[PDB]
Amino acid sequence: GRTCPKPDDLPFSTVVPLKTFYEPGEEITYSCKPGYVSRGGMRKFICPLTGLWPINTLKCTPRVCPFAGILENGAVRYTTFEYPNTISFSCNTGFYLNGADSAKCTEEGKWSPELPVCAPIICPPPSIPTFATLRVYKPSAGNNSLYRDTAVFECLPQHAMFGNDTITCTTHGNWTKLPECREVKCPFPSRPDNGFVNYPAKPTLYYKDKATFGCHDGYSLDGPEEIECTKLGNWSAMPSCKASCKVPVKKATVVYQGERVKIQEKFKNGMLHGDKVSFFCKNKEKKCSYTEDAQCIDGTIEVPKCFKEHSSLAFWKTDASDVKPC
Ligand SMILES: *[C@@H]1O[C@H](CO)[C@@H](O[C@@H]2O[C@H](CO)[C@@H](O[C@@H]3O[C@H](CO[C@H]4O[C@H](CO)[C@@H](O)[C@H](O)[C@@H]4O[C@@H]4O[C@H](CO)[C@@H](O)[C@H](O)[C@H]4NC(C)=O)[C@@H](O)[C@H](O[C@H]4O[C@H](CO)[C@@H](O)[C@H](O)[C@@H]4O[C@@H]4O[C@H](CO)[C@@H](O[C@@H]5O[C@H](CO)[C@@H](O)[C@H](O)[C@@H]5O)[C@H](O)[C@H]4NC(C)=O)[C@@H]3O)[C@H](O)[C@H]2NC(C)=O)[C@H](O)[C@H]1NC(C)=O
Ligand SMILES: *[C@@H]1O[C@H](CO)[C@@H](O[C@@H]2O[C@H](CO)[C@@H](O[C@@H]3O[C@H](CO[C@H]4O[C@H](CO)[C@@H](O)[C@H](O)[C@@H]4O[C@@H]4O[C@H](CO)[C@@H](O)[C@H](O)[C@H]4NC(C)=O)[C@@H](O)[C@H](O[C@H]4O[C@H](CO)[C@@H](O)[C@H](O)[C@@H]4O[C@@H]4O[C@H](CO)[C@@H](O[C@H]5O[C@H](CO)[C@@H](O)[C@H](O)[C@@H]5O)[C@H](O)[C@H]4NC(C)=O)[C@@H]3O)[C@H](O)[C@H]2NC(C)=O)[C@H](O)[C@H]1NC(C)=O
Ligand SMILES: *[C@@H]1O[C@H](CO)[C@@H](O[C@@H]2O[C@H](CO)[C@@H](O[C@@H]3O[C@H](CO[C@@H]4O[C@H](CO)[C@@H](O)[C@H](O)[C@@H]4O[C@@H]4O[C@H](CO)[C@@H](O)[C@H](O)[C@H]4NC(C)=O)[C@@H](O)[C@H](O)[C@@H]3O)[C@H](O)[C@H]2NC(C)=O)[C@H](O)[C@H]1NC(C)=O
Ligand SMILES: *[C@@H]1O[C@H](CO)[C@@H](O[C@@H]2O[C@H](CO)[C@@H](O[C@H]3O[C@H](CO[C@H]4O[C@H](CO)[C@@H](O)[C@H](O)[C@@H]4O)[C@@H](O)[C@H](O[C@@H]4O[C@H](CO)[C@@H](O)[C@H](O)[C@@H]4O)[C@@H]3O)[C@H](O)[C@H]2NC(C)=O)[C@H](O)[C@H]1NC(C)=O
């Protein structure tokens, strides 16, 4: 007699019982696979005497989970919302994901886990360190702060801040490192030889107290006029009063700070300690002029050997300063 052959394999379906041939009268059942549905549901068929399976209209399609394309204050990555697809979640800047960062459309057509929600990152009010005060703080969310809000500490008078005055509200709802404020003391600064020092009239000097230095005529400071008590207990500097130099020649054109000057004119009131200058010398061979340097150090300046004075107009090809350069 005729038999029906092995039934067609339709997409996303199973057939029960599955055999390679059937006697007329035997029943098969097509079902959608878990996670699929079809217009009509299960199709049952009985092998007819002709041995021909009739037409099967079963169309098995994925279950569709509910629309999950919008995360308030964030983003969803998805292709479609159908079984068995995963969707991914993330939050805009300043929000955190309250829930799982992914979810799956299950064979039952619901999301697992449940869809998350985005919420504002918040820090509680910050603690004030000891001997610190709070300059810049205003809450931006009820009484709490929002992500990347800042607070600024300043120390009490006579206290140095170790660390940094500005804290930020982090992603972890806690603030960045607090700074410490300790009291710091400096010794009295030493009066320099050939000068004086002024600092405030009181028995101890603290962080940020200023001392100013002066020199007697004929001396200048070899460092800054004003110094301050630093966070490490020492002073910003300790300058000396150093001796000025007499102009070492009666008349000469020199280079000072990259320009030609008359040394008698530019330094009519002496040369300060530090003042550097270049004297002009003649190369007799190549009939041209070169410079050698000289510096005022604590009342002494060494004019180069090559320099020849009584410079008006005399020596062949005139003053070294007026001769063509080498
Ligand atoms: C706000 O709120 C937040 C929420 O919690 C807080 O955030 C936390 O920050 C703290 C740290 O302050 C975190 O805890 C700590 O985690 C440290 C890092 O762990 C990583 O490395 C571990 C190595 O064993 C490993 O177990 C982890 O897997 C982890 O690794 C990584 O994985 C990520 C991916 O997920 C990768 O991207 C990373 O690249 C990868 N990194 C690594 C290294 O693999 C941890 O070190 C720290 O331990 C200290 O404190 C413990 C206190 O009980 C103590 O038991 C530990 O021993 C340790 O201490 C020190 O010991 C270590 C050695 O174990 C010393 O280090 C070495 O010295 C060797 C010399 O012999 C040298 O050879 C080595 O090279 C090395 O230098 C170290 O010197 C010791 N230090 C001291 C002082 O003794 C701790 O467990 C916490 O997990 C964070 N949580 C969160 C949610 O963020 C935040 O703190 C809050 N903020 C404020 C301001 O309060
Ligand atoms: C910045 O952030 C800070 C910190 O959070 C914040 O400061 C907070 O500010 C709020 C308000 O300014 C303070 O709190 C609450 O104030 C209560 C006083 O008033 C009420 O009455 C007025 C009347 O005009 C009404 O208008 C108010 O709305 C309010 O009453 C309401 O009453 C109706 C009745 O019709 C209810 O329908 C409402 O639910 C109720 N509303 C509210 C909001 O409560 C004060 O009494 C409360 O105190 C509570 O909660 C405290 C939590 O810390 C707790 O310490 C207290 O002890 C007290 O809790 C009491 O708990 C008892 C048990 O432990 C309970 O016992 C009896 O009741 C039940 C019976 O069923 C049983 O438990 C028991 O058998 C017994 O009979 C008490 O009932 C219960 N008391 C109350 C009143 O419920 C609230 O504090 C905050 O205190 C304050 N927080 C801090 C830390 O300062 C600030 O506002 C923020 N800044 C900004 C700008 O936002
Ligand atoms: C205590 O420690 C703190 C933590 O380390 C210190 O804070 C840090 O300060 C430094 C410098 O002050 C910050 O870094 C620098 O950032 C520069 C990048 O700046 C940007 O410029 C881009 C243009 O090319 C913009 O597209 C960016 O938006 C950004 O912005 C602007 O910056 C302007 C000032 O320059 C400002 O006027 C604008 O309003 C602002 N605009 C915007 C949108 O931001 C780099 O060029 C530098 O090389 C360097 O990286 C550093 O970021 C900051 N720490 C953190 C976590 O942000 C703090 O200084 C210290 N306190 C003390 C007293 O030392
Ligand atoms: C006011 O206060 C303090 C004194 O209380 C002064 O601080 C001192 O300043 C010096 C330099 O400014 C610092 O010490 C050393 O710093 C550098 C770099 O140090 C780094 O590199 C070393 C490797 O050499 C390594 O350990 C670390 O990575 C470190 O960060 C060094 O090059 C140098 O180190 C040596 O100093 C020795 C003298 O003590 C010599 O024998 C060595 O040959 C070499 O020069 C340098 O000394 C410190 O910060 C600090 N020192 C101490 C002891 O406290 C501060 O300068 C002063 N200011 C004023 C204005 O008076």
From Swiss-Prot:
The family database entries (SUPFAM superfamilies) matched by this protein are listed as: Complement control module/SCR domain
Protein known as: Beta-2-glycoprotein 1
- What's its job? Binds to various kinds of negatively charged substances such as heparin, phospholipids, and dextran sulfate. May prevent activation of the intrinsic blood coagulation cascade by binding to phospholipids on the surface of damaged cells.
What does the record say about tissue specificity? Expressed by the liver and secreted in plasma.
Please give the chief subcellular localization of this protein. Answer: secreted
Q: Which UniProt keywords apply?
A: Disulfide bond, Glycoprotein, Heparin-binding, Repeat, Secreted, Signal, Sushi
Q: Where are the transmembrane segments?
A: none
Q: Got a GO cellular component term for this one?
A: very-low-density lipoprotein particle
Annotated GO molecular function terms are:
heparin binding; identical protein binding; lipase binding; lipid binding; lipoprotein lipase activator activity; phospholipid binding
Q: Which GO BP terms, alphabetically?
A: blood coagulation, intrinsic pathway; chylomicron remodeling; negative regulation of angiogenesis; negative regulation of blood coagulation; negative regulation of endothelial cell migration; negative regulation of endothelial cell proliferation; negative regulation of fibrinolysis; negative regulation of myeloid cell apoptotic process
Post-translational modification here is noted as: N- and O-glycosylated. PubMed:6587378 also reports glycosylation on 'Asn-188' for their allele.
Residue ranges of the Sushi domain? 2-62, 63-120, 121-183, 184-243
Glycan attachment points: T14, T130, N143, N164, N174, N234
Give disulfide pairs as residue numbers.
C4-C47, C32-C60, C65-C105, C91-C118, C123-C169, C155-C181, C186-C229, C215-C241, C245-C296, C281-C306, C288-C326
Q: Where is this region: Sushi-like?
A: 244-326
Keyword Heme present in the record's keywords: the answer is no
Q: Subcellular localization, per the record?
A: Secreted
Species assigned in the record? Homo sapiens (Human)
